[PDB]
Design an enzyme around this catalytic site. Structure first.
Site, PDB file in Angstrom:
ATOM      1  N   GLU A  59       0.550  -1.104  -0.226  1.00 25.87           N
ATOM      2  CA  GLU A  59       0.184  -0.520   0.415  1.00 25.87           C
ATOM      3  C   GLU A  59       0.971   1.501   0.232  1.00 25.87           C
ATOM      4  O   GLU A  59       0.152   2.361  -0.301  1.00 25.87           O
ATOM      5  CB  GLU A  59      -1.047   0.013   1.478  1.00 25.87           C
ATOM      6  N   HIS A  60       1.972   1.208   1.130  1.00 24.19           N
ATOM      7  CA  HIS A  60       3.292   2.177   0.024  1.00 24.19           C
ATOM      8  C   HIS A  60       2.977   2.752  -1.155  1.00 24.19           C
ATOM      9  O   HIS A  60       3.327   3.552  -1.713  1.00 24.19           O
ATOM     10  CB  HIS A  60       3.820   1.774   1.878  1.00 24.19           C
ATOM     11  N   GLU A 136       7.434   5.249  10.888  1.00 26.95           N
ATOM     12  CA  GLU A 136       5.773   5.158  11.084  1.00 26.95           C
ATOM     13  C   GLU A 136       5.637   4.404  12.594  1.00 26.95           C
ATOM     14  O   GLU A 136       4.988   4.154  13.219  1.00 26.95           O
ATOM     15  CB  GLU A 136       5.371   4.449   9.683  1.00 26.95           C
TER      16      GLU A 136
END
Lengths: 445, 54
Positions: A59-60, A136
């Site tokens: 998804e990144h 993150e």
């Protein structure tokens, strides 16, 4: 026009299915905007230990580059029409949606096809993307709420893939490779588990014809034969305590094994959950809120952010509460919160059940406001249930549940069931697991 | 650790073992730990052969 008539209007969720497996589903009412996105069914549940965290990395890298759109040119397009492309990856579902004007619908679906099918996954972006995730991970480490829910999933569904975090341990993210991500995409981003969705000024015929001429290239077969199956998870009632006295407050989460998506017991239990309600120190209701636990908390300034939850996966879920209080309140709150549950399991009153039904109705109706929440509902419902539940059906189920039903379902799920408590910070008054399990049954009953 | 679910039960177990020892003593040999000479009425004219206390 009363409530019932407005519920009947409820523009429909026409659903179709092209040959390869992808099922489109739109909801057109009037709006000039739209929210078109796909809802690939993937997450930490479909991930082994070796590759735990691949989905977050994919998804990144989704928006970074494509074979068609070379690099940030995709971003240039998306910002050219002012669209707000976004993506979220839960433990079960991973979705990409574009919030854009309806006139630019033909371009948006093309952009979605490029991101979800022709993704470069280029190595240098993988290296650069590696640093972002690691940072993150530290940011989520400071996310004193999120780590508690991760602890909950780890200490409840031990061994099972559900215990795995969404982002992944900070060792797989430092050893991943293009090979591992490409298998994730090949084994999960497949047409049968993909729900093209739209809401707003989106004609269902438009969505269908666009899907045929953009998404038909998606395949349904699975490499040689390997089909990632469903691994049912087990709820191991346990306790995890990360005692860290430096933290100011003490997040605690307690949950028992609640039902799955298909189980109708969601409707009564939610009402019961709505009975306990939610509270924050900045609410303003104070010692007048009808929820007993909220009134007690505001009267004695016990908690700051207690709130119930109904995290519900495909076959099992977590049902319980998460409260944030100072060090010398936990022992009291575990008394009151549990003391509330048993009350619902023994002496639920139709007077408060009506309030719970009203709260649930308002929550369901208000949550389905705006195109993006509608698209989220469509994408999530076609996967979890297999059909978008119309609000009329929700109203019928809410009408069925009463005091006896709530009492029965709470006794069947709450009473005498081993919890899955999970602490963090200066948790010391947090009663030992023996005490917590002791509170799970009432000697009067 | 909290006292209630813990040692309370362990204390009860210890009390049961203590009751076991005490009941064995009472029910199988009451006068095992006791001199039989005490069963003669106290006569302040005859010194017993031994004056051992308990």
């Amino acid at each position: 026009a009363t409530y019932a008539q407005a519920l009947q209007s409820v523009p429909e969720t026409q659903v179709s299915q092209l040959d390869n497996g992808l099922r489109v589903a739109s909801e057109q009412s009037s709006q000039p905007t739209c929210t078109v996105g796909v809802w690939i069914d993937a997450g930490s549940r479909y991930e082994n230990e070796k590759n735990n965290g691949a989905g977050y990395f994919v998804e990144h890298l989704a928006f970074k580059g494509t074979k068609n759109r070379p690099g940030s040119a995709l971003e240039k397009e998306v910002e050219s029409m002012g669209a707000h492309l976004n993506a979220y990856s839960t433990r079960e579902h991973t979705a990409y949606y574009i919030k854009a004007l309806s006139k630019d619908l033909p371009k948006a679906v093309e952009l979605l096809a490029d991101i979800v099918q022709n993704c470069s996954l280029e190595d240098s972006q993988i290296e650069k993307e590696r640093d972002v995730i690691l940072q993150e991970l530290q940011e989520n480490d400071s996310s004193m709420r999120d780590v508690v829910f991760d602890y909950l999933h780890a200490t409840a569904f031990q061994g099972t893939p559900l215990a795995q975090s969404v982002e992944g341990p900070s060792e797989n993210v430092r050893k991943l490779s293009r090979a591992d991500l490409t298998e994730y995409v090949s084994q999960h981003y497949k047409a049968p588990r993909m729900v093209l969705a739209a809401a707003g000024g989106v004609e269902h015929r438009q969505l269908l014809d666009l899907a045929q001429k953009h998404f038909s290239s998606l395949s349904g077969t699975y490499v040689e034969d390997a089909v990632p199956a469903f691994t049912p998870c087990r709820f191991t009632g346990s306790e995890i305590r990360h005692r860290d006295d430096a933290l100011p407050l003490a997040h605690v989460a307690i949950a028992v094994e609640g039902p799955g998506w298909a189980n109708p017991d969601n409707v009564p239990l939610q009402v019961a959950n709505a009975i306990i309600g939610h509270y924050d120190s900045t609410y303003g209701g104070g010692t007048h809120m009808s929820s007993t636990l909220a009134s007690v908390a505001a009267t004695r300034k016990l908690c700051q952010s207690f709130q119930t939850f109904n995290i519900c996966y495909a076959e099992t879920g977590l049902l319980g509460a998460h409260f944030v209080c100072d060090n010398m309140s936990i022992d009291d709150m575990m008394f009151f919160l549990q003391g509330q549950w048993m009350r619902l399991c023994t002496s639920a009153t139709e007077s408060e059940v009506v309030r719970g039904k009203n709260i649930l109705r308002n929550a369901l109706v208000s949550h389905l406001d705006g195109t993006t929440p509608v698209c989220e509902d469509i994408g999530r419902s076609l996967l979890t249930y297999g059909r978008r539940i119309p609000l009329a059906e929700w109203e019928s189920r809410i009408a069925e549940v009463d005091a006896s039903v709530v009492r029965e379902v709470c006794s069947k799920y709450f009473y005498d069931q081993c919890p899955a408590v999970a602490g963090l910070g200066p948790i010391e008054q947090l009663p030992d697991y023996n005490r917590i399990r002791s509170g799970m049954f009432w000697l009067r009953f | 650790i909290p006292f209630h679910p813990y040692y309370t039960i362990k204390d009860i177990l210890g009390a049961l073992f203590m009751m076991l020892i005490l009941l064995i003593l009472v029910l199988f040999s009451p006068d095992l730990l006791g001199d039989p000479d005490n069963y003669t009425p106290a006569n302040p004219l005859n010194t017993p052969p031994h004056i051992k206390p308990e």
